[PDB]
Amino acid sequence: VAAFLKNVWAKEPVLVASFAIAGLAVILPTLSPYTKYSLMINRATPYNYPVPLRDDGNMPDVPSHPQDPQGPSLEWLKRL
Amino acid sequence: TYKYVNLREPSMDMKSVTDRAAQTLLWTELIRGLGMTLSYLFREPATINYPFEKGPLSP
């Protein structure tokens, strides 16, 4: 079966190259950590309006000032 | 006498197939050969302007 890759690649060299692109395409999205950066950006794109809520006692976090360090940090991308 | 033309068995080894695989897949044939032998356009057109120019003859 070791020459089976060398008696068809010298016989029909078209679909042999297709199966190699069938390979190396399913496997790699589960491999490199550049994915889940695809997920963090695609969720952090603001379409709609972020409506604020009503305070009653608490206040667990996030006061009215927008430029305060009160929310998350997606600002790694601008530094990236 | 003889001559046996177009009578040659293939190579069939590890490396020489890569010369026959790059031929079909990436077309190192048909452009180096047939795109250069056409151009070859810069030669002078050998045309006789018949009402003015005339060709050779014999006595």
DSSP state of A29: G
Cα gap B59→B51, rounded to integer Å: 22
Cα gap B38→B30, rounded to integer Å: 11
Inter-residue long-range contacts of B17-23, CB under 8 Å, 24+ positions, other chains counted: B17/A6, B17/A9, B17/A10, B20/A10, B20/A13, B21/A9, B21/A10, B21/A13
Report yes or no: A16 and B20 within 8 Å, Cβ to Cβ: no
The CA distances from residue B53 to A33, B43, B44, B50, B58, in Å, are 77, 20, 16, 5, 17
Tell me if chain B has a CB within 8 Å of the CB of A6: yes
Structure tokens at A3: 């020459």
Number of residues that make up chain A: 80
Structure tokens at B24: 């079909």
Measured in angstroms, the resolution is 8.3
In sequence order, which residues have a C-beta less than 8 Å from that of residue A10 and are 6 or more positions away? Answer: B10, B12, B17, B20, B21
Report yes or no: A62 and A70 within 8 Å, Cβ to Cβ: yes
Which residues on A lie below 8 Å from B17 (Cβ)? 6, 9-10
Report yes or no: B43 and A33 within 8 Å, Cβ to Cβ: no
Cα gap B45→B56, rounded to integer Å: 17
Nearest by CB to residue A13, choosing from B10, B12, B21, is B21
Cα gap A17→A30, rounded to integer Å: 22
The residue in chain B having the minimum alpha-carbon distance to the alpha carbon of residue A8 is: B17
